[PDB]
Amino acid sequence: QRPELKNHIDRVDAWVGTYFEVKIPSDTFYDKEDTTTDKLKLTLKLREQQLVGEKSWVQFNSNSQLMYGLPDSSHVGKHEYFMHATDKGGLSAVDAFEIHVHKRPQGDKAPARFKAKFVGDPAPVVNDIHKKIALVKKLAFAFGDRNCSTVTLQNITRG
Amino acid sequence: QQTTLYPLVGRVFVHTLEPASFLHLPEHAAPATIPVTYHAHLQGHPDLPRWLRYTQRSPHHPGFLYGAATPEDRGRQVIEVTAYNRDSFDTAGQSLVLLIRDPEGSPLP
Amino acid sequence: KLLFSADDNEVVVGAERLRVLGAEGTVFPKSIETPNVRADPFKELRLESPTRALVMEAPKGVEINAEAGNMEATCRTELRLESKDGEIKLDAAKIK
Amino acid sequence: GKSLFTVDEEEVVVGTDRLRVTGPEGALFEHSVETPLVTADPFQDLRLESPTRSLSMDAPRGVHIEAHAGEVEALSQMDIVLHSSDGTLVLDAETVCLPKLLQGTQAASGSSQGLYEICVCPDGKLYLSVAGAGTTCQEHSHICL
Amino acid sequence: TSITSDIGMQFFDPRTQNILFSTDYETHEFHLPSGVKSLNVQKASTERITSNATSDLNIKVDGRAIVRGNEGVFIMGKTIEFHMGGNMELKAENSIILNGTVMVSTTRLPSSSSADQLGGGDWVRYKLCMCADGTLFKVQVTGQNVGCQVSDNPCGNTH
Ligand SMILES: *[C@@H]1O[C@H](CO)[C@@H](O[C@@H]2O[C@H](CO)[C@@H](O[C@@H]3O[C@H](CO)[C@@H](O)[C@H](O)[C@@H]3O)[C@H](O)[C@H]2NC(C)=O)[C@H](O)[C@H]1NC(C)=O
Ligand SMILES: *[C@@H]1O[C@H](CO)[C@@H](O[C@@H]2O[C@H](CO)[C@@H](O[C@@H]3O[C@H](CO)[C@@H](O)[C@H](O)[C@@H]3O)[C@H](O)[C@H]2NC(C)=O)[C@H](O)[C@H]1NC(C)=O
Ligand SMILES: *[C@@H]1O[C@H](CO)[C@@H](O[C@@H]2O[C@H](CO)[C@@H](O[C@@H]3O[C@H](CO)[C@@H](O)[C@H](O)[C@@H]3O)[C@H](O)[C@H]2NC(C)=O)[C@H](O)[C@H]1NC(C)=O
Ligand SMILES: *[C@@H]1O[C@H](CO)[C@@H](O[C@@H]2O[C@H](CO)[C@@H](O[C@@H]3O[C@H](CO)[C@@H](O)[C@H](O)[C@@H]3O)[C@H](O)[C@H]2NC(C)=O)[C@H](O)[C@H]1NC(C)=O
Ligand SMILES: *[C@@H]1O[C@H](CO)[C@@H](O)[C@H](O)[C@H]1NC(C)=O
């Protein structure tokens, strides 16, 4: 049978330069043949049923059933996405959700401002969101931190 | 057609609603078959006040107007309510008169 | 930048946002002119009349789009599809 | 001497007929809004989006969608239900285009039962007749009245 | 009666020391005044639009009306009309469903008269036929006695 839906995702709150990660709730979708979300295939899609690109600032892993991302100020504001829940029966249930990306609330008056210059071209690092999230989690691990969202990159300049 | 009710501050108020006399068009044979919803609002307003709310499981089930009177809403209150039959599309305007007054007797701390 | 004016036609207030309180609603006896009506997040949108008819017009087109949903045109008398000089098509894999 | 805008400790009276707020953020109406008319400024589109939930259009007297000089566009990603409960469905157009029908192969053998053909009453009433080797609309003219 | 400053107008009743009106909008939140006939706001977040019990709502616009239902639209009414000037387009992905006792405008739709002696003789034209499960399918006509019986069912086998 076609899977059914009970709870929606209202909206996702994100901030520019901050890494967010959301695990889908276990009661998000239901099917008479499956009864659980984890035993059912979950995908993320755009308005006309196109997946997120590799270079997009938000990605989502199906096996870890985990969405994640880090937005930029050129993508501040609203955005829309669809969650598609496909069972073994080849039938898809659909939910929609909206993501609000805000500017950094502290803004310009931060009491601390860390600055560092590295080696090599920043073009592949900026062009790759994978490199960006690896960098953020690597700073977080360098401080020994768990929640990598505590890093807020503010600006990168080619030198 | 109007009806006057007497709510009091402190406890709940609930009004079971029956389409037999609420609707100007009688429902003969088995009246429980016909599905009718109800939309209740303050007169000249789109919605009930904060203290009052409305629910309905299914259109084939009676609706319910319910809420707890507040001391800040004491006095005379007017409810304009429309019986929207889910099938018969029949408009039945109705007025309810509420007199929110103080409770009588010992309080309930 | 103009932050207040009050002349013989109208009063312009240049506030960043308009924020009304009260859950009972509001009454605007004449009209609302809004270029974009958007639903509240996590909330429905409803365009209904309590006891009367609803008429809506757009001389340059109407797009009803259900990007993931249905078009449940529930009537009881007539689903009139009256085109002056155009045509009707049912673009779907199956027709029931 | 006509009042135009007044303030005091009691209220803020606006005696004019328009109140424009230019802020790019916009209004925030925390519940439903009563009005007999909604529109926009001239030569400006209006979008009624429901970005995260569904939408309904309900009228006890009827809904009349009009585009007198334009077109009605209705595409949906899912099934579309033209559910006339027990009423009629008049489709008034010069041309009806059905380019996405399944193609059938005529043969003497019958795959199964329940096969019918579409038949038209002279008044526009549409019905069905039992499918056969030839046409059977003419044999089943009882329903037409 | 113009005024000009960096901050702007102000007024507070000295008998309350409350700023009854100001124009530094970031500080004091604006509220809706009383007695307003119309308001023309460039963006509205409306839960519901409704009329009063006497007259009709009119969603009238010189521009185009784009109503989009992310989880779907439901039109409920007694007499439901669609008066378009040009073409009417009804597009679906899975299927269309026309449930009801359908009529048609016989005068408006053209009818092929038999005055011509088989001008479209032995021509590739299709006949609409009714499946058991409500589906419709077109069968090409070869001779004068082509019915709706098929062997290779495009309706699918009637499982
Ligand atoms: C931003 O700077 C703050 C420094 O204030 C970083 O937060 C700090 O994180 C460490 C964990 O790596 C906290 O250490 C604590 O140690 C005590 C010792 O008993 C233990 O009880 C705690 O459970 C924790 O392990 C430290 O307190 C905390 N500082 C706070 C909360 O003020 C933060 O990671 C930095 N974010 C970045 C660099 O993105
Ligand atoms: C963060 O990095 C950005 C980009 O490296 C810096 O913004 C840049 O600021 C310079 C200085 O004004 C801009 O140069 C000139 O800008 C004007 C317009 O303001 C333009 O007409 C000139 O042709 C020239 O490009 C540069 O455009 C601008 N880059 C942008 C906006 O992308 C910014 O200063 C850095 N901030 C911090 C805190 O490090
Ligand atoms: C009975 O239970 C209902 C539901 O919990 C109570 O109604 C709630 O009352 C609170 C406070 O009176 C309301 O909170 C207010 O919300 C507004 C926004 O609408 C906010 O601006 C205020 O600052 C305040 O936080 C709440 O909205 C309201 N909820 C509903 C659904 O009406 C009611 O008070 C309870 N009555 C008794 C006697 O216990
Ligand atoms: C329910 O909504 C209807 C539709 O707007 C209201 O009827 C209209 O009410 C307005 C304001 O009360 C009337 O405007 C004024 O009317 C007087 C005489 O009626 C006229 O001399 C003025 O120049 C001005 O136009 C409008 O005429 C009236 N229209 C009709 C057809 O009745 C009605 O008042 C609303 N009722 C409630 C209880 O909200
Ligand atoms: C990590 O930081 C976030 C701030 O976005 C906070 O919500 C979360 O609780 C932190 N993690 C832990 C383990 O406290």
From Swiss-Prot, chain A:
O-glycosylated. POMGNT1 catalyzes the initial addition of N-acetylglucosamine, giving rise to the GlcNAc(beta1-2)Man(alpha1-)O-Ser/Thr moiety and thus providing the necessary basis for the addition of further carbohydrate moieties. Heavily O-glycosylated comprising of up to two thirds of its mass and the carbohydrate composition differs depending on tissue type. Mucin-type O-glycosylation is important for ligand binding activity. O-mannosylation is found in high abundance in both brain and muscle where the most abundant glycan is Sia-alpha-2-3-Gal-beta-1-4-Glc-NAc-beta-1-2-Man. Glycans are attached at N147, N155. Coiled coil: none annotated. It is found in: Secreted, Extracellular space. Extracellular peripheral glycoprotein that acts as a receptor for extracellular matrix proteins containing laminin-G domains. Receptor for laminin-2 (LAMA2) and agrin in peripheral nerve Schwann cells. Also acts as a receptor for laminin LAMA5. This is Alpha-dystroglycan. It comes from Oryctolagus cuniculus (Rabbit).
Swiss-Prot record, chain B:
Keywords: Cell membrane, Cytoplasm, Cytoskeleton, Glycoprotein, Membrane, Phosphoprotein, Signal, Transmembrane, Transmembrane helix. The keyword Transferase does not apply. It is found in: Cell membrane, Sarcolemma; Cytoplasm, Cytoskeleton. The keyword Magnesium does not apply. GO terms for molecular function: calcium ion binding. It comes from the Eukaryota. One of its GO terms (cellular component) is sarcolemma. Cross-link to form 2 major subcomplexes: one consisting of SGCB, SGCD and SGCG and the other consisting of SGCB and SGCD. The association between SGCB and SGCG is particularly strong while SGCA is loosely associated with the other sarcoglycans. Interacts with the syntrophin SNTA1. Component of the sarcoglycan complex, a subcomplex of the dystrophin-glycoprotein complex which forms a link between the F-actin cytoskeleton and the extracellular matrix. Belongs to the sarcoglycan alpha/epsilon family. This is Alpha-sarcoglycan. It comes from Oryctolagus cuniculus (Rabbit).
Curated annotation (Swiss-Prot), chain E:
It is a single-pass type II membrane protein. GO terms for cellular component: cytoplasm; cytoskeleton; sarcoglycan complex; sarcolemma. Residues 1-159 are extracellular. Belongs to the sarcoglycan beta/delta/gamma/zeta family. It comes from Oryctolagus cuniculus (Rabbit). It comes from the Eukaryota. Its main location: membrane. Disulfide bonds are present. The keyword Iron-sulfur does not apply. One of its GO terms (biological process) is muscle organ development. It is found in: Cell membrane, Sarcolemma; Cytoplasm, Cytoskeleton. Disulfide bonds join C129-C155, C131-C148. This is Beta-sarcoglycan. The keyword Transmembrane helix applies. The gene is SGCB. The chain holds residues 160 to 318 of 318 of the full protein. Glycans are attached at N52, N99. Cross-link to form 2 major subcomplexes: one consisting of SGCB, SGCD and SGCG and the other consisting of SGCB and SGCD. The association between SGCB and SGCG is particularly strong while SGCA is loosely associated with the other sarcoglycans. Component of the sarcoglycan complex, a subcomplex of the dystrophin-glycoprotein complex which forms a link between the F-actin cytoskeleton and the extracellular matrix.
